[PDB]
Amino acid sequence: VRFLDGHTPAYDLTYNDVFVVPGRSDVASRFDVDLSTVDGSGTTIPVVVANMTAVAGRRMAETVARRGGIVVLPQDLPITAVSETVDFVKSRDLVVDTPVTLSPEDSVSDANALLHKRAHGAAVVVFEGRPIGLVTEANCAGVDRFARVRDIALSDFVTAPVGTDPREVFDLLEHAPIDVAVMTAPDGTLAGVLTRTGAIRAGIYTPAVDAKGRLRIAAAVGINGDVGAKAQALAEAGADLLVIDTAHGHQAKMLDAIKAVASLDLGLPLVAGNVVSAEGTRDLIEAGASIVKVGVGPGAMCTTRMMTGVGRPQFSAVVECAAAARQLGGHVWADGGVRHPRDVALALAAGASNVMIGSWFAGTYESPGDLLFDRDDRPYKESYGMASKRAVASSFDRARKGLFEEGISTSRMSLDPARGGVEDLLDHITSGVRSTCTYVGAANLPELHEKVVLGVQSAAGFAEGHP
Amino acid sequence: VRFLDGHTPAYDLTYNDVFVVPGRSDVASRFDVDLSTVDGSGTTIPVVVANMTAVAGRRMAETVARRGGIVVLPQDLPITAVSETVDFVKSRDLVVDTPVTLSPEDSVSDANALLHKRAHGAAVVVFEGRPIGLVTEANCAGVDRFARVRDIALSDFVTAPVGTDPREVFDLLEHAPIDVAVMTAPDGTLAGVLTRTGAIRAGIYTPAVDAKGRLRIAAAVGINGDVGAKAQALAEAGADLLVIDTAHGHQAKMLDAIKAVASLDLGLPLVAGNVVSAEGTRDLIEAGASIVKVGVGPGAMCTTRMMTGVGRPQFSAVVECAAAARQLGGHVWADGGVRHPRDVALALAAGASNVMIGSWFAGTYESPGDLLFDRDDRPYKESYGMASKRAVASSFDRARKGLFEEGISTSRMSLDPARGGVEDLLDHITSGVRSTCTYVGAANLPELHEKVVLGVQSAAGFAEGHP
Amino acid sequence: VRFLDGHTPAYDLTYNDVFVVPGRSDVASRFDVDLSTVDGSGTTIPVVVANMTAVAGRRMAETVARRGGIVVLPQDLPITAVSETVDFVKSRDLVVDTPVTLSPEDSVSDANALLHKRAHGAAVVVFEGRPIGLVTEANCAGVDRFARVRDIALSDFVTAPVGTDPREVFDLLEHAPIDVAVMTAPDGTLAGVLTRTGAIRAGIYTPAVDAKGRLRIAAAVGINGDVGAKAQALAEAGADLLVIDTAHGHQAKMLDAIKAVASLDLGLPLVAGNVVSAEGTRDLIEAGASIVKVGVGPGAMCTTRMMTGVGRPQFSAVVECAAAARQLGGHVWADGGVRHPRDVALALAAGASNVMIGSWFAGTYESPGDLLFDRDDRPYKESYGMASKRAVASSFDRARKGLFEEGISTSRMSLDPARGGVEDLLDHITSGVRSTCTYVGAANLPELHEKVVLGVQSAAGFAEGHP
Ligand SMILES: Nc1nc2c(ncn2[C@@H]2O[C@H](COP(=O)(O)O)[C@@H](O)[C@H]2O)c(=O)[nH]1
Ligand SMILES: Nc1nc2c(ncn2[C@@H]2O[C@H](COP(=O)(O)O)[C@@H](O)[C@H]2O)c(=O)[nH]1
Ligand SMILES: Nc1nc2c(ncn2[C@@H]2O[C@H](COP(=O)(O)O)[C@@H](O)[C@H]2O)c(=O)[nH]1
Ligand SMILES: Nc1nc2c(ncn2[C@@H]2O[C@H](COP(=O)(O)O)[C@@H](O)[C@H]2O)c(=O)[nH]1
Ligand SMILES: Nc1nc2c(ncn2[C@@H]2O[C@H](COP(=O)(O)O)[C@@H](O)[C@H]2O)c(=O)[nH]1
Ligand SMILES: Nc1nc2c(ncn2[C@@H]2O[C@H](COP(=O)(O)O)[C@@H](O)[C@H]2O)c(=O)[nH]1
């Protein structure tokens, strides 16, 4: 990638150590740039939710797929749950979000705990398939925790049929006391709930769909055990994309797994990682992988940097691997070390065909975890590492292996008190990437890579601007 | 050592300034790599406990020797105590740990204070050489501090003969209320205590033993006074390895001491330090030393960096000295600046034949110190510097020398509330080194040095990953 | 009642202002005295749970009725709920407590919130009427809040048939990991759960039962509206005792209500209040009431003392009214101002045929409220006053009446961290009353009244003893 004159630092650079120099721009507005990825994963935004059990669930899968990004299901997961999640996601409206359906016999405690499963802020009490009420934080508060939800003073909702343009439902919700509105099927059954900002987003983002027009989804497999059988069963389960993940993506087991999956000829794009070296990417590409995950160590839950000293600063690894893959025709997914939208913008600028968010999305409403509360009542969630799920594998043998195994690290990802949903994190990331495109003057991601110029900055250079 | 292309920093690098780039790996698991050292010290793990009076004791000596690492006894120690410690260590079971033996006439206060001498969490009340009870933090609490230990409501213990495989004692302790189990001699006398995790570790680690199959131990001498007589008496005392330590290992006194010890022809491997220069290592090797300690200043208790400005970043000194020693056939021990297992992994990667832990192990159960408690009740221990014990030497003369002498610095090394024993610190270090081997793809430490590739990282590069 | 010589204070005395002087005693132990009441309410202990919606529920009703005390259902309650509660209570085992029955399809959050409904500390997961598991605070913690209770790692329980003596189940639970044991019906269906301390209490307390051997229960009616119809419907609903409660029990409306209920000839004992004057008790007795509630103002939730200045110190009012009622043959229930068992003992000593606890029992596991948690995580519950439910009665009229109406006062009754159940509060109260009987030397409550001698004490007199 192009660098400023005289910029040959004697160290690998991270995201905080680099910056983008704006160039001559012809892109008028942020909406004039398209974020469609070229990697073949079919994501209209360069965002992938990581294959972490704390960040990858059915709700996040459907939400991000509707917003145009693919979601990788966590590895080492019972294929029954995988099939259930895939069937759930593929049966979702391309525009309307699936609400928190509440049976009239549910308790107040269950309703209150479920209200935070989604970012809508309200839950639908539905009887016999017909929506009969709405609950929120207001009517639920004060009443007894174990009273039935049929006696929670159900509020009135704005009902509209499925197929009305986002304009009409938007103006319908201009003065609505409750932001959400129930999209009902023509027969009268509830089909979903659409929000004011959801109506806004329905036009900006184009949902990522497969050849059959269903929300794309992905799943991950390890290398321990029969990789071929697991990958084949995953492909038959309906997963659009297969991701083979391990702590070290340059070992012979990784190459054998990629070779087996490629020989299976499943037709789905191939994703392997992680390698932070050009030779590792070359080996993975020659092994039969179309997409290469890059980054071992920058992950916010990754510990190997402190325990082993291995790793690489994310930006330099991403740019070198992207150069290698583009030399061999392959494509690159940056993984780990993403905490600000500048990280996404720089990862795409370095040459990566896509970026993968990880534990940042764990601090969202839709992450498959428990929304706990701290002492100061600030919302947050616990993010865990994959640990043995990303590692190559009687009571004695189990405990002996577990003694030397890296512990499951835990972190507290705080929720935004106002913009807590993953919708708003995606909005921030996409706005940052669009602004980067406008500053560079690129109409698309390949043009972003081609026309970006990057400079090096010191520690004090990062202090410039408002945090 | 191999470095990334374009990495020629204009400054000496420390451990935080370098990282290991993973390469093509054929090592399947962490257990597939052996950590046996080539230096001739006969340690099966690359860990040496420093010659500090706050970190080197009989308990740490026997524990680390059983786990495969050598321990250097502190210098300026009465040879009577040295002989007692060496005889104690050489008379230890290669598998079973020596417990806290409690006579029935001991007080409750003594039992409670002794319970934290070892990591077992329980102490054995033994009468006439026969184990009769077990005490822990539960039964001891609440009872009067000065009641006899024969009335502390002794609990029941799992008794097994010496020679049962760790499998059998492991399954015997699966549902045991007390984790420890008493290994008894065939005549019925108590021979030791083995723990559940001790049973686990008995197979993973191979104890470091001499030609007679006894736990290896080492001792240290200074340069002031007759070095030859002290070294000869130490060799006759039973010490396997001799370490000659001083603040400045490049002075003429150091060379004279090494020359005298080499002329003694004691047969034990020779260890001298510290020098952070290639010429210093060359002089030490030519003086008759097989192993060279490197690092003056990076020590967590070392003050000379702030008082004098002398020293060197540990990683660059280690790699340069290792290159010099391997040119002359000598071998290198990194000393100081070890706080994370990444430090050990990088020290071995730089070319050092071994690493020496130091004050990190002072915050353990087995360190020869007093387990004090802070206000927040978090366990911790006080680590002190060697000071004049590592420096070259009437009331007037004594006080005059002491006025200019560096004060004995003190630090508070906190105990891990759960994994406080040195067994678990060794587990963490060994797991980190094994993971580094797998990431590099090395089957042994020489292969680790040969096949490692190191890059340079900025300050923000160290922030990547979970702390 | 007898007083010490020279004790003629010029002020009405409260419980803190009086004390009992022990006399010549022939009662050997506390178990040698019986606490059976003479008032005809058929309570074997002198404890009545108040007609407060925050303290009177089905769980408290059944528990206190099994322990020998009657419970007055709150007034202004839908007779459908009254009938449901009465049928639930009358269908309870005289020895075994009804546990927290958990269907296998309940969520983890519901199970955790339900676990604190009873004092057993464990909940029974029952399938098809057959107990299949037990949950507690241990197995529930850590697992996902919305996982099904069929996957909460159900524990094993001690199963015994219904009819085994408390001795056998007591010894069965001597070493049981879970204190509770499931009493199962002969056909195998679950009939209840009995605890270790429940087995202990099954012999000490004799359950209060009606002529048909069913747990006695009581209900309350106001004076506004048709008192006769409400009282008759309550009697047909199965309530054993009728309590007519109002803020001022000396008004003409109170007398008319008592006259109507007496003319109804329902056969149940008559309870009216509150009057703190001898003339008020005389009027209530002549109106057709057998039992008179005494005390307006001492109630821990009562506010009229601060707002209006009306009221009376509880002890003097109780003793004067008891003297008047015993002159006319009526009987007295002390109400309000009970916070320590000394209050109960003094109320019975003053001459009251019974005492009524009130908001003290609101801070229990079985109180019909929500067990909330404070910042320091100390358990507690919110106690509310009856307000308009104890007061004599369009939007304009409603708001106009509510403007001048006393607000529903709220108090925080803290739970005992260990002895939080109402079983243990009853144990404390009964132990205090039994000890008072032994100190006086009385074999029964009438003997307590006859043989008690009371003295007056100053403010500093109350400081004597351990708080
Ligand atoms: N009643 C109800 N529970 C829901 C709904 N969505 C999620 N849940 C709860 O959340 C669980 C799955 O959590 P997830 O994996 O989707 O974060 C379900 O098994 C169920 O307990 C909903 O619409 N209604
Ligand atoms: N070595 C290691 N990497 C992990 C673990 N958990 C997650 N990761 C890596 O870190 C990524 C997420 O980090 P993030 O992008 O949130 O900073 C994952 O996609 C995965 O590549 C773990 O336990 N160990
Ligand atoms: N009674 C008793 N004291 C012990 C035992 N192990 C260590 N100690 C105490 O610890 C002292 C030595 O401490 P160390 O140098 O081993 O940390 C001994 O002199 C003795 O007071 C043991 O097994 N039993
Ligand atoms: N100059 C100096 N070095 C010390 C002193 N105490 C320990 N050291 C050095 O620091 C090492 C331990 O440091 P650590 O490895 O714990 O950071 C020792 O092995 C020794 O080389 C002291 O008082 N002065
Ligand atoms: N599932 C279940 N809910 C119970 C049980 N006992 C009480 N509850 C809950 O508590 C409510 C009544 O509370 P209460 O008035 O008894 O304090 C019920 O409607 C129900 O929601 C029980 O055994 N099982
Ligand atoms: N005036 C008045 N008395 C109340 C109210 N709530 C409860 N009480 C009285 O206070 C009694 C309970 O008080 P405690 O016995 O807990 O101190 C009740 O039985 C009733 O007599 C209220 O809101 N106003």
Swiss-Prot record, chains A, B, C:
SMART domains xrefs: IMPDH
CBS domain boundaries: 95-152, 153-211
Swiss-Prot/TrEMBL cofactor(s): a monovalent cation
Gene3D superfamilies: Aldolase class I
Catalytic residues of the enzyme: 302 (thioimidate intermediate)
Residues annotated for NADP(+) binding in this entry: 245-247, 295-297
Enzyme class: oxidoreductase
Gene Ontology BP annotations: IMP salvage; purine ribonucleoside salvage
Activity's dependence on pH: Optimum pH is 7.4-7.8.
Activity-regulation annotation: Activity is allosterically regulated by the ATP/GTP ratio in a pH-dependent manner. At pH 7.8, GTP has only a minor positive effect and ATP only a minor negative effect on the activity, however, at lower pH values, the effects of ATP and GTP increase. ATP-dependent inhibition can be restored by increasing GTP concentration. IMP and XMP are competitive inhibitors.
Cross-referenced Pfam families: CBS, IMPDH
Record text on subunit structure and interactions: Homooctamer composed of two tetramers. The oligomerization state is regulated by ligands and pH.
Family in the record: Belongs to the IMPDH/GMPR family. GuaB1 subfamily.
Function according to Swiss-Prot or TrEMBL: Involved in the purine-salvage pathway. Catalyzes the NADPH-dependent conversion of GMP to IMP. Is not essential for viability, but may contribute to the regulation of the purine nucleotide pool by recycling GMP to IMP.
Protein name per Swiss-Prot or TrEMBL: GMP reductase
Organism whose genome encodes this protein: Mycolicibacterium smegmatis (strain ATCC 700084 / mc(2)155)
Name of the gene encoding the protein in the UniProt record: guaB1
